[PDB]
Amino acid sequence: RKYFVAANWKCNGTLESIKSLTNSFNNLDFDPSKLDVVVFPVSVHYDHTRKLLQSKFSTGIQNVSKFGNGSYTGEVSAEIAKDLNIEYVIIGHFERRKYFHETDEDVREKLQASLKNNLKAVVCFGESLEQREQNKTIEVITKQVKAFVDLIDNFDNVILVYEPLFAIGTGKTATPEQAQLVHKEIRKIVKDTCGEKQANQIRILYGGSVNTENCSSLIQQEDIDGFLVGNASLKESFVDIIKSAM
Amino acid sequence: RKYFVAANWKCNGTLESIKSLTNSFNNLDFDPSKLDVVVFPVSVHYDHTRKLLQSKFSTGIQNVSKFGNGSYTGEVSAEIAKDLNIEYVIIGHFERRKYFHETDEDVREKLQASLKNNLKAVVCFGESLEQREQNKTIEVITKQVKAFVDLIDNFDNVILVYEPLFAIGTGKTATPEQAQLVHKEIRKIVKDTCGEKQANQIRILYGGSVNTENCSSLIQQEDIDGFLVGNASLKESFVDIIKSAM
């Protein structure tokens, strides 16, 4: 199972900060055939970032439309992404489910659209704090994963990301042990619905808060195949996070 | 009052179609100091387009975030738009109100963020068929415009667009006279809430179906200062539509 480390720059960056950042990133010597390292800049920053990053680095966009080409002002369709040779796309990130009312139905349609166009997809899901305290974690995640999991035809092209919302900006922290449990269950769902071969083939990333300090203990976990890094990916120290997966 | 002709390519285009289209566009000879012509490509297409189009053409993006930089995956902030020297942004296009639940609230915050960052904004609004059959046109439009009109500090940097939804995809057609009445009322609203000077300065574009045939009859109208063109702007004949404003 090939490790997957992704940098979700989210809504951050300037042409200068990116030029400076990608420069550091490029100094890290790693074998792309042994590790997947993806960077997701802001859509308008894609071209700039892509030119600046060396081939060993994959690039994608933080969101894609559930509709195809057509009258949908402000959207980016998978057809357009394909035409642009954009490799990955993030779908269902909690920030979009939260602020932009994206639903599991949306996540499903977006995934289907992405795959139909040969885009690799990093699909996110997770439970809120309320959901965790009510002890509905497994339940919620099962409903979320089962909302799209039956569309995955190739388990190398779809990467799942567990976002423990209950730990993001709530004063709480997710421990490697806790993530390991959830990951194991997420993988179990995939097995029971797609098969063991698939379940062992698909990468499941930790989408919680990752930093130079906790990355090693997290990646160590059996069912944690890497992570979707937030703010830490906006600093040069991100390479040390990539290193912990080499 | 300087005429304003915009091309809202919406979610359309491939690197090749754009290369070809901008080619035609560049052939049109016009004085940018006398006429404002703006093209709004897909975010991931901005750069490609900007490089292909000549200086005489202004460019912008079809949407902008109501938040600033930070944790908002998939969004583009005004701060980022400014760093990239993106001149215009479209806000409140009915397509984002319809499919992406953008509210007047969202439009206000997006406009504010836009101006705060020195971006020029093309703000859209308009009533539905249901709302027109109930004779609530002026009422609805009055409510929409008054949701953001007080934020306008420079009436050259904000462009209003009246989108007659009741005539978009309903089989009905808006006549230059009908549009004119609304336009006059919209301007009247600005006059009373911002002053006469401002009112005669701000441009109010027609956002309905515009084509090589009806553009002249529309631009003729007193209070119609140009248009936000859709599918017609994806064709070479778009130049003719520009000509009708020269």
Tell me the H-state helices in chain B.
15-27, 46-52, 78-83, 94-98, 104-116, 129-133, 137-145, 176-194, 196-201, 215-220, 238-243
CB interface of B with A, residues 30-49, below 8 Å: 42-48
**Resolution of this entry, Å:** 2.8
Q: What is the CATH number of the domain that holds A186?
A: 3.20.20.70
Technique behind the model: X-ray
Catalytic annotation on A93?
Answer: yes
Chain centroid offset of residue A212 CA: 18
Task: Give which of B91, B61, B88 is closest to B76, Cα–Cα.
Answer: B61
What residue numbers bound the domain in which A29 lies?
1-246
Return the beta strands (E) in A58-100 as ranges.
58-61, 88-91
Best residue of A19, A38, A44 to probe chain B, by most B CBs closer than 10 Å: A44
Residue type, B128: S
Helix (H, G, I), strand (E, B) or coil at B32: coil
What percent of the residues of chain B are helix, what percent strand, and what percent coil, each to the nearest 5?
Answer: 45, 15, 40
Catalytic annotation on A222?
Answer: no
Residues A17 and A133 sit within 8 Å (Cβ to Cβ): no
Altogether, the residues listed in chain B come to a count of 246
**From the CB of residue A98, how many other CB atoms can be counted at a distance below 10 Å?**
13
* Domain total of chain B: 1
Between CA B128 and CA B139, with CA B133 as vertex, the angle to 5 degrees is 65
H or E segment and range at residue A104 = helix A104-116
Residues of B within 8 A of A62 (CB-CB) are 73-74
B75 touches chain A (CB under 8 A): yes
